[PDB]
């Protein structure tokens, strides 16, 4: 006449409680009464496990409700998930995974991911619609500046709802993080230093050769070279922006007889277009943006440079061109590199330093962060737990929401801590997310059309792009495992289609998180299997693959300053045999800045102990049996992708693992 009621508490440090637990089991012939649990403690990592016996005959076991009753001061309980045994021998599973506070009481689902259309009885409607209600009370949309993507509504991170939070307060933390980083750096001494420039290169190798890995020495030794500088457009930190040309810009009025001596196949400049041997990179983004004026003793600068380049013999990209700013003229020169040493170093500094500032604002912050966030949130206020695509979705959003409004309490809010060494701050980086919000579309998040679009699919053509390569590979496993769990629980388009929870969640991207401007293409619905699965490879590939390739490879290409500098203390050089090393020294960031930008970007690349990378799922949402299968399917493929990246780094001078699956996390955790 018994159920044996187990209850699993979270791993995390604070998942115990000492506070008291009633549990009550919602049958369809009845409730069960409350029942208090253990009159103790419940430890961290520890599974607790009770025979409870009932009064009458509950049937079939529908809901468990928990419930919290203080006891002392609030102490916030993990549940991670209760398993029934039945007194007619079945074993029922209720996967939680959710923070319970003193405040509500929690009322669970079993395992078995369901629709809407499968709820046919009243307890279980109910509970859907009251999960629902709740969801989007907690949950709240917010624009926190002008034209940005819709976020969560809350001013800092303990204003979050509790589930979304971190697992620690102060766990993840851009002051506390950086401040630390600064000190594993050995660079502490420097944080103040905002008025002294560098003695000379020597003065920051000194300082640099302590606390450089593999990549970032390749990079102090070889940064002058033309090969490094066109390899990071495809291979770097930041291999988004290069575009095949199909004509010169009218904006660029360079000729063959300024790059002549770069050209190696007898052609004159306009056929090499032609043969599609030209590539140009354009910061037009740039042009307009505020400089950052938030130090009235530093004047910080901006450009807005196009760079012309170009694929040698040897099937290399280098530069051949480069203008610093967008109009022509007398005060804007072309630099070739035929052009005084520094005069073409100093113009590819600058070209570097704006790939930085369209890296950390658009390609990192809006087209990854943000746009994840909004998957995010749309998922929590519209898809109840007990929905398949909350299941596959959840491990995917991960703390986004809550690194995101530590971002916006510390790092990029007025007066953060990203004002103090970008030439950004100050509300420039806020212009450039509003601008770019514009051109953010549906099909340039679709990876394989993303690298079209820019006429750089051709593997045969442009063999040394690996960013293309192991992005298109982790995207088609990406794609086939969604379009497995897809299958699985969906009969047909026509179920996609009449899916009231699933086309209010797509409805909630299009309309708050897109702002409902109809130019982003992001679908108003979704009617069939097969586009679901490209949507849910979208939110998925968004919050890892594409994340893991521009995000932990800062330290290694900018952590050597003059490859990456995160603000410029003199403007552009607007005449040429002027430019002197001793200027660029005092052009490029001080100390101070120096030192903030290093730790930034080392704090930024750090994985967690605990880090799950793509295709680990601890917490079992899932728990039925096909499912399962699909998602060992999808770790078989990841493991072989490693392999295929593995051996390709072997015969690589500067290997790319950056998109390798086992170095992946499941979301944006950083
Ligand atoms: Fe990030």
């Known amino acids: 006449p018994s159920y044996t009621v187990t209850v699993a508490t979270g791993s995390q440090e604070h998942a115990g409680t000492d506070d008291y637990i009633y549990l009550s089991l919602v049958g369809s012939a009845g409730c069960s009464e409350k029942h208090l649990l253990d009159k103790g403690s419940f430890e961290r990592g520890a599974v607790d496990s009770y025979d409870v016996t009932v009064d009458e005959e509950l049937g079939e076991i529908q809901l468990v409700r928990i419930e919290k009753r203080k006891y002392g001061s609030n102490d916030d309980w993990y549940l991670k998930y209760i398993t029934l045994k039945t007194p007619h021998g079945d074993y029922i599973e209720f996967p939680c995974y959710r923070w319970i506070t003193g405040d509500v009481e929690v009322v669970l689902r079993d395992g078995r991911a369901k629709l ?363 794609r086939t495992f969604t379009a497995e769990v897809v299958d699985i629980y969906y009969e047909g388009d026509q179920v996609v289609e009449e899916d009231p929870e699933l086309q209010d969640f797509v409805n909630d991207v299009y309309v708050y998180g897109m702002r409902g401007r109809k130019s982003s293409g992001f679908p108003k619905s979704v009617k069939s299997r097969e586009q679901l699965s490209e949507y849910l490879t979208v939110v998925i590939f968004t919050a890892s693959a594409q994340h893991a390739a521009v995000n932990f490879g800062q330290y290694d290409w900018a952590s050597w300053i003059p490859n990456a500098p995160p603000t410029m203390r003199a403007p552009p050089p607007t005449a040429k045999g002027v430019v002197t090393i001793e200027q660029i020294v005092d052009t490029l960031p001080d100390r101070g800045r120096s030192c903030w930008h290093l730790g930034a970007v080392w704090a930024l690349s750090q994985f967690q102990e605990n880090e799950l990378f793509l295709g680990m799922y601890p917490e079992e949402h899932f728990i039925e049996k096909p499912v399962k299968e699909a998602m060992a399917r999808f770790r078989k493929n990841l493991e072989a992708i490693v392999s295929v990246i593995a051996e390709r780094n072997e015969n690589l001078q500067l290997p790319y693992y950056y998109l390798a699956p086992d170095r992946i996390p499941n979301s944006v955790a950083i």
């Open 116 to 478: 809407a259309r499968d709820d046919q009885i009243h307890i279980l409607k109910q509970h859907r619609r009251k999960e629902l209600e709740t969801r989007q009370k907690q949950y709240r949309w917010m624009e926190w500046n002008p034209g940005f993507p819709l976020s969560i509504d809350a001013k800092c991170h303990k204003d979050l709802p509790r589930d979304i939070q971190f697992d620690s307060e102060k766990g993840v933390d851009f002051v506390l993080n950086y401040s630390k980083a600064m000190e594993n750096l050995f660079i502490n001494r420097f944080m103040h230093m905002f008025q002294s420039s560098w003695n000379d290169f020597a003065d920051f190798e000194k300082i640099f050769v302590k606390i450089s890995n593999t990549i970032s020495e390749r990079v102090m030794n070889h940064w002058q070279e033309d090969l490094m500088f066109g390899y990071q457009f495809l291979n770097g930190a930041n291999p988004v922006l290069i575009r095949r040309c199909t004509e010169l810009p009218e904006k660029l009025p360079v000729t063959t007889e300024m790059v002549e001596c770069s050209l190696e196949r007898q052609l004159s400049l306009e056929q090499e277009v032609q043969q599609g041997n030209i590539f140009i990179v354009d910061f037009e983004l740039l042009d307009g943006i505020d400089a950052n004026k938030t130090d009235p003793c530093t004047l910080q600068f901006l450009a807005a440079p196009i760079c012309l380049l170009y694929k040698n013999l040897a099937n290399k990209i280098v530069p051949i061109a480069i203008q610093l700013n967008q109009i022509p003229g007398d005060e804007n020169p072309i630099f070739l590199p035929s052009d005084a040493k520094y005069d073409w170093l100093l113009a590819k500094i600058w070209v570097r330093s704006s790939d930085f500032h369209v890296h950390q604002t658009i390609t990192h912050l809006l087209r990854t962060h943000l746009v994840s966030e909004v998957f995010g949130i749309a998922m929590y206020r519209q898809l109840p737990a007990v929905h398949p695509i909350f299941k596959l979705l959840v491990a995917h959003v991960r703390f986004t929401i809550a690194i995101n409004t530590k971002a916006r309490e510390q790092l990029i809010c007025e007066c953060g801590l990203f004002d103090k060494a970008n030439a950004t701050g100050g509300g420039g980086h806020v212009q450039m997310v509003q601008r770019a919000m514009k051109d953010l579309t549906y099909a340039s998040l679709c990876f394989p059309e993303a690298i079209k679009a820019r006429g750089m699919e051709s593997k045969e053509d442009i063999p040394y792009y690996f960013y293309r390569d192991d992005g298109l590979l982790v995207w088609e496993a990406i």
